[PDB]
Design a protein around this ligand. Structure first.
Ligand code: HEM
Ligand code: HEM
Ligand code: A1CN5
Ligand code: A1CN5
Ligand code: H4B
Ligand code: H4B
Ligand code: CL
Ligand code: CL
Ligand code: GD
Ligand code: GD
Ligand code: ZN
Lengths: 401, 401
């Protein structure tokens, strides 16, 4: 039962919830591997059993009549068909828990406010595209972003998987150039090659929005173009540095992760895209300044006429801070929801206290909760954390190709 | 079973085969990761044997004459007395290897340049004090800082204990009020409470260099007044915000860690203060800007006429970069050795590649190697790392009371 200290205030709690940790992680007492980014009918039953207990515990009918039937229904249905179907209420309850259990998510103060779309009756890549366009449309909401998840038909024996090949619903093309370089986003060179190979006529800008590659079961992926007027984008400008808009930088409003597997009570939904709103550092710091991403840091500092020959001038840090300022200003100007890493960490601390009262702890991967700049300026820096895996959960899964 | 370790800036891959040697066990289990937590008889022969076998390999004397010979003397030394004394070169070799194995030290590229003063024949606090004072004056070197460590007599059973009560050789006072809140450094409130109890006259400053509380075996502590000309300090000023000097800020030159316990070949030296030189973020970001330390961030932001009303202004981030610029600037002006976090982390990557070729890996705790500001702007953010306990080593130790 770990003792967890917060160093800002001095408080101490004990994460009793870590004992309920089911699936095991990559660390042992010999060696910690926390900083690594990427770490049968009877067991389907005990996961299903556990989830149904969870569900009924949340509705205050733990141990009741209905409880007994469900357990009995799920067993007899596994025995009969090898699997079982979630009810709608149980599905909504499991999308929410999966978010509440994501240790690398800082936005989890919002976990109970989640719009779940049941698309488990989906039938084709063409229906799949329609459900997605409506997800984007509802989540985006003209800049007043809302959290949503669309759940496509679960993995099941006999049929292939529904898969979204794109890591996110909105990605920018990454074209490998002549001289080995990359135009656009380098994290998406591969999805870009696949889209071309499947008949997408490429562009050559730095911010070409990628088509969707949508895989129906036992089917090749099919190419679908997003309507331009569905993808709300924000041009990036600086409140005081007016040469900044001459960079032509843009980002998109809607962060919608689309390649993660959703796990509920032993069942697996390999296509369940979810979306919220951005924190300024993900765009400002990571997407635009990462040396393997758009890598603008140098060009900004040169424009700012900072001294880039030496590092002790902290030109990197000065340029980066104004790149974030610009992201926050641009998004509020465009009236698109956005949260800065101070407010986001502040309110994640409020999540951490709400969680301690409710379950006795909270899965949190420190290295992902602390923002990529100004770490120790936020309060999550000084909070010790305990990293474990609870189910329901979003897990990574391999690329379908 | 050789952990795959990736660098995400470049995409390179290495395997840490050194992690297999981890004798002492850390705090993580497959159930939960505790990496972000700060803290948690003739077996002595096995520790002494393996340490000796390191030594002779490091001098290409694996399996020859003196190798077996020295092995015999340990066997016999312990057989007679129940403990043993280190050949002075082994003391030097283990002092350097403990530094080389410190997972949380980002300055380990300097590990081979360590001055080891041998204080093993010490008896009395007045004796320590001079061993300490020679260390301080050697390492400071009029501001040309030099890594040094002084090794006071190892612990043996039935004996007392050499302990330096201060967490560091140079610590600022912290004074409580008719309203509680601290003037000076709140991290040192306690040792200031002790220093006064043992008769020290309290000052009224926010940068009052504490006395020392040195303690010899089986004896109470003795206060020691450090000579002011030995405590080299740097007044803080900012190159272009001329009011910064007016704030009255200072920090000292010598980062000197007393209260940690050297552990070599099964011997335990509870008094073994080491020293090197500062990285600017330790001073500007941690010591001056932590909410539980001096916490000057809002004060500097007022003076910059920043909009502290909203957090999306990134006033915290802006003021912090300037506080760091002033620390770098001030140390460079005083001709005192200092290193910024971009220079430091880039030198630590040159360390990891060095260590790959040499020992097949390196133990590194990611959360302390990444700087407390601008983390993703430094290359070590993008480097996966593995944390484990090699020996020799510096360990945390309980307070001597
Ligand atoms: C609405 C505001 C939200 C904010 C501010 C937010 C913030 C973040 C951030 C900064 C990360 C780390 C990103 C990275 O890997 O660099 C993250 C990860 C994650 N988020 Fe959230 N998120 C939000 C909503 C959601 C929603 C609605 C879901 C699911 C329904 C979700 C699920 C996850 C998961 C599973 C991860 C871990 C995967 C990973 O980071 O690699 N988040 N979130
Ligand atoms: C020469 C320049 C050096 C630099 C720039 C440097 C820098 C750092 C920094 C920034 C930390 C962060 C840990 C924290 O903030 O708590 C650290 C930890 C540590 N360093 Fe170094 N260091 C240097 C030399 C040394 C030497 C000479 C030794 C011992 C021989 C040493 C041993 C350690 C240990 C044991 C820790 C972890 C203990 C702890 O942080 O509680 N370092 N160092
Ligand atoms: C719903 C939601 C809201 C929000 N605000 N942010 C996210 C980001 O989620 C993710 C981002 C990535 C890419 C991470 N790379 C490091 C920098 C880019 C991978 C994932 F698996 C995520 F889950 C998701
Ligand atoms: C030799 C050396 C060189 C260098 N440059 N820095 C150091 C600091 O090491 C340490 C710092 C602290 C204080 C921690 N404070 C809370 C946040 C800061 C405690 C330790 F136990 C250390 F070991 C040591
Ligand atoms: C290798 C390193 O652990 C990796 O870059 C991690 C560190 N922390 C992170 N934290 C967040 N929020 N997002 C990330 O992508 C990462 N990357
Ligand atoms: C909770 C967290 O692990 C803890 O505050 C650590 C994080 N990283 C740190 N890094 C350094 N250099 N110094 C520290 O005190 C800490 N504190
Ligand atoms: Cl993103
Ligand atoms: Cl310090
Ligand atoms: Gd301007
Ligand atoms: Gd003024
Ligand atoms: Zn761990």
């Amino acid at each position: 039962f770990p003792r967890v200290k917060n160093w800002e205030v001095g408080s101490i709690t004990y994460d009793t919830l870590s004992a309920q940790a089911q699936q095991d992680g990559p660390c042992t007492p010999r060696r910690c591997l926390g900083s690594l980014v990427f770490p049968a009918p009877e067991q389907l039953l005990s996961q299903a059993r556990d989830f149904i207990n969870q569900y009924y515990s949340s509705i205050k009918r733990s141990g009741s009549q209905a409880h007994e039937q469900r357990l009995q229904e799920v067993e007899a249905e596994v025995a009969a068909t090898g699997t079982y179907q979630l009810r709608e209420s149980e599905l909504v309850f499991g999308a929410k828990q999966a978010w509440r259990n994501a240790p690398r998510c800082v936005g989890r103060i919002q976990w109970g406010k989640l719009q779940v779309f049941d698309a488990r009756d989906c039938r084709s890549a063409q229906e799949m595209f329609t459900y997605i366009c409506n997800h984007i449309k509802y989540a985006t909401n003209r800049g007043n972003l809302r959290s949503a998840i669309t759940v496509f038909p679960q993995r099941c024996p006999g049929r292939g998987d529904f898969r979204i090949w794109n890591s996110q619903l909105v990605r920018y093309a990454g074209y490998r150039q002549q001289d080995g370089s990359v135009r656009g986003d380098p994290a998406n060179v591969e999805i870009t090659e696949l889209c071309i190979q499947h008949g997408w006529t490429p562009g050559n800008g730095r911010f070409d929005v990628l088509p969707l590659l949508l895989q129906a079961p036992d089917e090749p992926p099919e190419l679908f173009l997003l309507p331009p007027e569905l993808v709300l984008e924000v041009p990036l400008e600086h409140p005081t540095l007016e040469w900044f808009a001459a960079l032509g930088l843009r980002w998109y409003a809607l962060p919608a992760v689309s390649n993660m597997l959703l796990e509920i009570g032993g069942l697996e939904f390999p296509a369940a895209p979810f979306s919220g709103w951005y924190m300024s550092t993900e765009i400002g710091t990571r997407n635009l300044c990462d040396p393997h991403r758009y890598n603008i840091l140098e060009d900004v500092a040169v424009c700012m006429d900072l001294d880039t020959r030496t590092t002790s001038s902290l030109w990197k840090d000065k340029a980066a801070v104004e790149i974030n300022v610009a992201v926050l200003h641009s998004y509020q100007l465009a009236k698109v929801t956005i949260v800065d890493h101070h407010a986001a960490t502040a309110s994640f601390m409020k999540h951490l206290e709400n969680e301690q009262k409710a379950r006795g702890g909270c899965p949190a991967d420190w290295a992902w909760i602390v923002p990529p700049i100004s770490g120790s300026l936020t309060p999550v820096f000084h909070q010790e954390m305990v990293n474990y895996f609870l189910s329901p959960a979003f897990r990574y899964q391999p690329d379908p190709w």
